Structures are given as C-alpha cells and as structure tokens.
C-alpha cells in the first residue's frame, strides 16, 4: 500500500508518534516519504545481504528476522514480513525501539539526508488529523 501524506500523518498520530521520545510527527512522515515514498511493501536488498523492509525501511541485519541475513540480531523480535503489511502497527512498534537507542532518528539515512534540519512540520500541514 501507498499512503497519502495526510493519510499517513493521521495514521502515525493514531499510533502515537506525534511526540515520541522528542520527535515531532513531521519527522516520521518526512522519513517515510524519503525512505519508502509512503509504500508499505517497499523493499531494498543491501550490499551486505541485509534487506530494508517497509514504509520505514527497517534493516534485517539489526531489527527484524527475514531468515536470510548473516549476523541478524533481530532487536525488534519480529519477522521482517510483519513490516510489509498495510497495517503499520509492527513497523511503528519496531521504529519506536530503534529511536529509543542513542542514535535516535539518525538510524534512518534518508531521514538524516532529507529531513534532519528541514522544516519537517511542513509534512503535516494542510492535513485533517
């Protein structure tokens, strides 16, 4: 599924990301935008055999178990397939664990390169929440 900008913002607000661990909602919509372009089925195989899954491109090397990545750690104790659902529950639950680490949202490369330092709140403006 491909969420609309406002559709995702409202959904993420429902999943409690409006101000999770110091990150305003705009951050999460922006990140999803440049990470997967709002596509929940998006996947990307990396140079280390790990794969990024979901609307938030969660990596199989540290976060989820896809069963085919070398030193998989599965910190989110969840199978990567759960992060490919049209239902964002798993992706959010896992992303909250990721951001609870000291690296914060820097865990997301696209977010760091396209959102950190920009007017992220712009991503929720003009939306019925």
């Amino acid at each position: 599924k491909v969420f609309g900008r406002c559709e995702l913002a409202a959904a993420m607000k429902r999943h409690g990301l409006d101000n999770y661990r110091g990150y305003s909602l705009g951050n999460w919509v922006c990140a999803a935008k440049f990470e997967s372009n709002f596509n929940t089925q998006a996947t990307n195989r990396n140079t280390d055999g790990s794969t990024d899954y979901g609307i938030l491109q969660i990596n199989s090397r540290w976060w989820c178990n896809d069963g085919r990545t070398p030193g998989s750690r599965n910190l989110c104790n969840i199978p990567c397939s759960a992060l490919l659902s049209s239902d964002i529950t798993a992706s959010v639950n896992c992303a909250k664990k990721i951001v609870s680490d000291g690296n914060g949202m820097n865990a997301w490369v696209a977010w760091r390169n396209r959102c950190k330092g920009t007017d992220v709140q712009a991503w929720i403006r003009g939306c019925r929440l």
Epitope: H15, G16, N19, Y20, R73, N93, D101, G102, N103
Partner: antibody, heavy 113, light 107 residues
C-alpha cells in the same frame, strides 16, 4: 528461550555502592535493550534506566546521576551500580528487557547502618 | 516528568464480575501506555502494550483502551488468578514513569 536472574548482596551500608548483576540465558546480551526497575516498600515502581544495543544509556533523573548500567559480553550479563546509597534506596530490584516480556525474579536490597 | 495517576487505588470484586481500571497522564502520550500485573513476591508481567495491543500468553479477558491522557484496562469476568496489583507505564518520554497502581482483591 530467554531467562534473567539478579544476583548480589541483600544488605548494604549507607553511603556505599550497591551493585547487582543480571544473568541472561537463551540469547546474547548484544541482541536487545536491558533495563533495571525497582519497587519501593510502598508499592511504588521506579524505572531506573536501560542500556541500548549501541551502548548508549538512559538514566532516571531521580537517581541524581548516582547510577551506572554496564554490559559484559563475554559473561553475557549486565549490571547496576548505585553510588552513595541511603535508606531511601531500600527496595526490590528487577532486571528486565526493554520490551518488558522478560523479567528477573527481583531481589530485595536493604540499606541499613 | 509525565505523571500517571491511577484511580481507584483499591477495588474489590466478586469473581465472574467485570472491572475497569483507570490511568490518566499529566500530558498526552498518544498510545504509549502499557499495563502490568504484579502478585506478591513476584515480578511484573506485561498484560497490554501500547494502550490496546494484545500480548501472547496473556488471557483474552484482558483488554486496554484509550489514547492521549485517558486510559483504561478492562478485565472481562474476573478470575481468582487476577487478584493483585495493576500498574500503567508510559514510554512516550524519558524518564519512563509508572502510575501509583490499583489493587484488585476478592469482594
């Protein structure tokens, strides 16, 4: 599967450093976030802090920076150090994973002269 | 620090009856409110996570609801195994905090 267990002294003296060890079995310490939670005599719970996979830590301001949480990979166990304790630190200590599904048995530590 | 308040502090019920336990936060925390149960001489057990998500291994009679600052934990048809303490905890902001707890005992 995963199991946690706290070990350490039950009785400590005021002003000394209270230390507890949490033994993890069933998986590597390096594969999760680990925490410490204590229960005060009045049925009051306080989240002390946790250490994430990158080694970064988060401590409860209430502890006024007397706390330290470290990991020992080889021994597959993590610890809690609490400096200059007072009778106010008397409580039942628990170690648990960040997710909250795995908890130790909890261990009472009494601070007394 | 976010402050979680649980009321009532004590609740007496007859097995077979249903109860609802309240937990309010001093400010909004979205869905970042979790429920724990704790029996004497025992460690806390996660019942509900993120306001309403179920936990594998926990009886189905337990359910949570709420968002923002108002939350409730529900026990459809209380059982003897359910008497003990119930605590809510927020993870929206650091430091994580617990509510004062509600005690559930036989009427």
């Amino acid at each position: 599967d995963v199991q946690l267990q706290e070990s350490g002294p039950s009785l400590v003296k005021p002003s000394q450093t209270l230390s507890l060890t949490c033994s993890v079995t069933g998986d590597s310490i390096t594969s999760d976030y680990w925490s410490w939670i204590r229960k005060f005599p009045g049925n009051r719970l306080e989240y002390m802090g946790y250490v994430s996979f990158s080694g970064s830590t988060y401590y409860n301001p209430s502890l006024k920076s007397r706390i330290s949480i470290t990991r020992d990979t080889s021994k597959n166990q993590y610890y809690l150090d609490l400096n200059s304790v007072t009778t106010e630190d008397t409580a039942t200590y628990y170690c648990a994973n960040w997710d909250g599904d795995y908890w130790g048995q909890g261990t009472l530590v009494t601070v007394s002269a | 620090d976010i402050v979680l308040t649980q009321s009532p502090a004590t609740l007496s019920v007859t097995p077979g009856n249903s109860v609802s336990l309240s937990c309010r936060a001093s400010q909004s925390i979205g869905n970042n409110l979790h429920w724990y149960q704790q029996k004497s001489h025992e460690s806390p057990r996660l019942l509900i996570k993120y306001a309403s998500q179920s936990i594998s291994g926990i009886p189905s009679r337990f359910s949570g609801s709420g968002s923002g600052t108002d939350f409730t934990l529900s026990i459809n048809s209380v059982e003897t195994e359910d008497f003990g303490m119930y605590f809510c905890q927020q993870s929206n902001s650091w430091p994580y905090t617990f509510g004062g707890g509600t005690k559930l005992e036989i009427k």
